Amino acid sequence: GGADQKGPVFLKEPTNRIDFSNSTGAEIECKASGNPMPEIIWIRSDGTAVGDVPGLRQISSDGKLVFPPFRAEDYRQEVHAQVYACLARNQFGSIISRDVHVRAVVNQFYGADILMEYVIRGNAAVLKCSIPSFVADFVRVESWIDEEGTELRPSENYDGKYLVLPSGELHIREVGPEDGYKSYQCRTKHRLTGETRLSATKGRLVITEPVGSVRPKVNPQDKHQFIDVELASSYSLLCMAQSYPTPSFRWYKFIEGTTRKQAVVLNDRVKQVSGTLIIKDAVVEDSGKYLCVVNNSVGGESVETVLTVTAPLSAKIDPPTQTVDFGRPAVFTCQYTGNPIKTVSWMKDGKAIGHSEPVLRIESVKKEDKGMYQCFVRNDQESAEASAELKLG
Amino acid sequence: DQKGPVFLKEPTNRIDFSNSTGAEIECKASGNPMPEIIWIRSDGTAVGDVPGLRQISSDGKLVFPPFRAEDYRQEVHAQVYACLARNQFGSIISRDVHVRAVVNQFYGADILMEYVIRGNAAVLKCSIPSFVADFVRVESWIDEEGTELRPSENYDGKYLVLPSGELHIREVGPEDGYKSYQCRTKHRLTGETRLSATKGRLVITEPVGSVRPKVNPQDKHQFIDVELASSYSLLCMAQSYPTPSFRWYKFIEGTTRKQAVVLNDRVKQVSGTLIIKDAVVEDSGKYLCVVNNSVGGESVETVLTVTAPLSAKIDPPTQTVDFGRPAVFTCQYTGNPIKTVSWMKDGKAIGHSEPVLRIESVKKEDKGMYQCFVRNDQESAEASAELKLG
Ligand SMILES: *[C@@H]1O[C@H](CO)[C@@H](O[C@@H]2O[C@H](CO)[C@@H](O[C@@H]3O[C@H](CO[C@H]4O[C@H](CO)[C@@H](O)[C@H](O)[C@@H]4O)[C@@H](O)[C@H](O[C@H]4O[C@H](CO)[C@@H](O)[C@H](O)[C@@H]4O)[C@@H]3O)[C@H](O)[C@H]2NC(C)=O)[C@H](O)[C@H]1NC(C)=O
Numbered sequence A: 001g002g003a004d005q006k007g008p009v010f011l012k013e014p015t016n017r018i019d020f021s022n023s024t025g026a027e028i029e030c031k032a033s034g035n036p037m038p039e040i041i042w043i044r045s046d047g048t049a050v051g052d053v054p055g056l057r058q059i060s061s062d063g064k065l066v067f068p069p070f071r072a073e074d075y076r077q078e079v080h081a082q083v084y085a086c087l088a089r090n091q092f093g094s095i096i097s098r099d100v101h102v103r104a105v106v107n108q109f110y111g112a113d114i115l116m117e118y119v120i121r122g123n124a125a126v127l128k129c130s131i132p133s134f135v136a137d138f139v140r141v142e143s144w145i146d147e148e149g150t151e152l153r154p155s156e157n158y159d160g161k162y163l164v165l166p167s168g169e170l171h172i173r174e175v176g177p178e179d180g181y182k183s184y185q186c187r188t189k190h191r192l193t194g195e196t197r198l199s200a201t202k203g204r205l206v207i208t209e210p211v212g213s214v215r216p217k218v219n220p221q222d223k224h225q226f227i228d229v230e231l232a233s234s235y236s237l238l239c240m241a242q243s244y245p246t247p248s249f250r251w252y253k254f255i256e257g258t259t260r261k262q263a264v265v266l267n268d269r270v271k272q273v274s275g276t277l278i279i280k281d282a283v284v285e286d287s288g289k290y291l292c293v294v295n296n297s298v299g300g301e302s303v304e305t306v307l308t309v310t311a312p313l314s315a316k317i318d319p320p321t322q323t324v325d326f327g328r329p330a331v332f333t334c335q336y337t338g339n340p341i342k343t344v345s346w347m348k349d350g351k352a353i354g355h356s357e358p359v360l361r362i363e364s365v366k367k368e369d370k371g372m373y374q375c376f377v378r379n380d381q382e383s384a385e386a387s388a389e390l391k392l393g
Numbered sequence B: 001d002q003k004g005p006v007f008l009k010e011p012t013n014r015i016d017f018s019n020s021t022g023a024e025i026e027c028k029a030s031g032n033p034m035p036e037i038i039w040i041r042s043d044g045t046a047v048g049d050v051p052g053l054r055q056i057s058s059d060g061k062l063v064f065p066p067f068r069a070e071d072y073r074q075e076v077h078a079q080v081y082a083c084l085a086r087n088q089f090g091s092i093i094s095r096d097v098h099v100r101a102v103v104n105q106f107y108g109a110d111i112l113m114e115y116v117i118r119g120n121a122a123v124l125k126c127s128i129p130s131f132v133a134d135f136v137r138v139e140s141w142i143d144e145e146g147t148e149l150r151p152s153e154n155y156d157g158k159y160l161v162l163p164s165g166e167l168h169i170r171e172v173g174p175e176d177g178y179k180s181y182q183c184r185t186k187h188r189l190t191g192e193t194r195l196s197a198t199k200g201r202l203v204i205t206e207p208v209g210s211v212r213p214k215v216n217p218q219d220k221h222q223f224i225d226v227e228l229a230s231s232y233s234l235l236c237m238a239q240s241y242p243t244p245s246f247r248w249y250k251f252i253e254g255t256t257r258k259q260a261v262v263l264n265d266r267v268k269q270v271s272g273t274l275i276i277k278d279a280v281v282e283d284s285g286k287y288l289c290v291v292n293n294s295v296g297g298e299s300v301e302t303v304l305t306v307t308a309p310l311s312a313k314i315d316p317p318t319q320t321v322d323f324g325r326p327a328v329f330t331c332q333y334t335g336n337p338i339k340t341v342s343w344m345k346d347g348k349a350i351g352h353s354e355p356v357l358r359i360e361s362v363k364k365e366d367k368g369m370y371q372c373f374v375r376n377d378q379e380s381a382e383a384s385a386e387l388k389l390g
């Protein structure tokens, strides 16, 4: 009881993003140890404790905050769109978990449209399923369907003419006059409701048969590309260009912070289909600036792509605990991983102390300085916390 | 009574033309005696006649008659030409002329259906195939009743046609659902005006809960290039419930600082769209659109680049220097950007890049015509001067 007394530490934290249908509801959980055992308190962004809301928000045993299923008219912003957090506290101090973003989605409007595409014979074609920005978080392309129905799904066989890219576009090798008679519909899936539906629009291709030579041209919006992909996932890099004769596509990666570039090596992991680079099992080193060089006899063109491979954020403090004599300095170092890293910030007993560096330093330790210390690592998506304790010697 | 050649009329940097229309480039130069005009390639070699394809007119213009698509020849129809003018006193070459013939090709405009949250502005775009993209643009938009929407200086209305050709729509309500919009494009080579068979539609949605401002990944970064004196627009494509506020800033170069954009007669803002007329080179820079509502935020980066036509001049236009005394040439030029400066003597590159060229001692060999050339990845310009002997 008195032996091995510790400040609190989180065993289990909720994930950064909690997104759920009003029909599904949600449950988040928080666990922490310590001696004495800490009390768990669900808090709001302003630091105040959240209470029960009938039929909407419920605090239960085992430190679980529950959001039951609810009618559309029952939607409440103060409940269903909010950032929560877990507060663990005992006599030695307080720690706050990473931000928990709770968003309930009441089932609503969405639909996909497919832009028609004029393509020169022999060139590759790309059909895109365009999804509204406000549903794009929960809605992505599952597959494609031709006029006969035949279902086209993503795969590792790149040898076929029809290929669904990791990003969801339908890629078609070496178009020909027959392809003009085919029409395609994209099937999208809502990850919250598990619902799937076909686009009302049918993607078409108009195949042009030029005699006179046409030089490579990239539409201005395709000239620069910015792609974000999760670590270990699969992804593709488009180079959108048409020419007669059909052009060649060469992919290079710039050496960071220089104008020099090296050709991208094709292997089991990295494949190239026409102008498209297809990469499975993303790695941290893939991140960087890429260049696609397009050439035919009459002219040439280029596409610049900035790739960012995101990795989950994690944080740790060295030491997890230390005992410092009065008057002597105390230093805390926040070790973190994940990509990208925007900020690093420090906290003491649930209060931001206004220090932005991985190293927190207390010049002269006093009574008031003892307690729990945290560092938070954040980016536009994820947050991660680490905790440590300062004791007086 | 005696003069070296100088160009009165030079061809433009770019000549684009349809195989149906053909094209004609003109070069005129003044000198005593009258200089002969010779057409050459980029490599400096003389161009010959190709029957039905490349010809010289009665007044000495290089002619590209209309031709069958099967008669397309790259050496003729994709080429960089130049005009060489000379007399007994020397030679001068005009700026590069990029000649590109374009065989008429089938094309059409499609319009993506736009889902819009009630109260938000909407932007409809006329999507054009890449191979006609340089030669085809939107001159207007037409609703279901045939009412023509033209770009205007009145920004207070419901509809606004932006310089880039998009149809901007203020504060979309569900009452706008029944309407349709078609773009009327213009082919500058063939002069053909045509109406899109596709009809742009707005689908209006009313969200149950609040919505954070959201920008599609491809709209997060934007890049705009515009010529001097020309009007343009900077889009911030974002939607939120309730409707958001749009704040435009401009970064101070080489810093994280930013200054808010100053709206005036020249610079006006419609919803989240920044619209500017009479572009100036100073407008060039990196901009930031910040979007806000009660429930969240979002941003859009835009790199703007304004270019100016290249022009060149040499001071003095002509000079006579005694044997042994130095001669000085200074190249005055304008336009943006300037990538390279190169000089020339009597049609031959002398390998000097500076705005100033000075001979320390004039010899009888130094007698002749001198030129300086300003260049970038698109445009080129020249200036000529004569040197005599005293
Ligand atoms: C979260 O919020 C969403 C959005 O408001 C709710 O979803 C709606 O729920 C209602 C009620 O269940 C759905 O109503 C539909 O009613 C059909 C007929 O029901 C009537 O049957 C007879 C007709 O006279 C009468 O007894 C009486 O009038 C009944 O009301 C059902 O057949 C529907 O079921 C099926 O069809 C729909 C598509 O129409 C499918 O999506 C369903 O999965 C099911 O296969 C349906 O129940 C309404 O359609 C829902 N809208 C949407 C967009 O899904 C959720 O209920 C709410 N979650 C909660 C409350 O937990």
Ligand SMILES: *[C@@H]1O[C@H](CO)[C@@H](O[C@@H]2O[C@H](CO)[C@@H](O[C@@H]3O[C@H](CO[C@H]4O[C@H](CO)[C@@H](O)[C@H](O)[C@@H]4O)[C@@H](O)[C@H](O[C@H]4O[C@H](CO)[C@@H](O)[C@H](O)[C@@H]4O)[C@@H]3O)[C@H](O)[C@H]2NC(C)=O)[C@H](O)[C@H]1NC(C)=O
Pocket (backbone or CB within 6 Å): A341, A342, A343, A344, A345, A356, A376, A378, B256, B290, B291, B292, B296, B297, B298, B299
């Ligand atoms: C209207 O909408 C705009 C756009 O969304 C909002 O502007 C954003 O505001 C947030 C918060 O104010 C900004 O995020 C913050 O940026 C600070 C500066 O970061 C710099 O330094 C780091 C290195 O540490 C670099 O990686 C980075 O590139 C910058 O150079 C951070 O220091 C902040 O972090 C600290 O504060 C937050 C709380 O805000 C803590 O959670 C963190 O742990 C840390 O202690 C913070 O990340 C964001 O950059 C702004 N966006 C833009 C585009 O400027 C407006 O806030 C909004 N208006 C209103 C009224 O809400």
Ligand SMILES: *[C@@H]1O[C@H](CO)[C@@H](O[C@@H]2O[C@H](CO)[C@@H](O[C@@H]3O[C@H](CO)[C@@H](O)[C@H](O)[C@@H]3O)[C@H](O)[C@H]2NC(C)=O)[C@H](O)[C@H]1NC(C)=O
Pocket (backbone or CB within 6 Å): A293, A294, A295, A299, A300, A301, A302, B340, B376, B377
């Ligand atoms: C295939 O296409 C690529 C891209 O269009 C061509 O590469 C580009 O070549 C141009 C020259 O034709 C380069 O511009 C030049 O740059 C120098 C400065 O380095 C400048 O002094 C010149 O006046 C000219 O503007 C351009 O940088 C280059 N870009 C890339 C990404 O390589 C390539 O030449 C084409 N292949 C063939 C065989 O032509």
Ligand SMILES: *[C@@H]1O[C@H](CO)[C@@H](O[C@@H]2O[C@H](CO)[C@@H](O[C@@H]3O[C@H](CO)[C@@H](O)[C@H](O)[C@@H]3O)[C@H](O)[C@H]2NC(C)=O)[C@H](O)[C@H]1NC(C)=O
Pocket (backbone or CB within 6 Å): B019, B020, B021, B066, B067, B068, B069, B103, B104, B105, B106
């Ligand atoms: C320049 O090249 C273009 C493209 O090859 C030529 O356009 C083509 O012209 C032929 C007629 O010579 C068109 O065929 C005919 O069209 C009419 C309708 O206009 C139709 O009734 C006939 O049965 C026949 O199909 C062809 O469609 C057209 N193609 C395109 C893409 O426009 C043009 O003639 C060339 N110009 C010159 C001066 O050679």
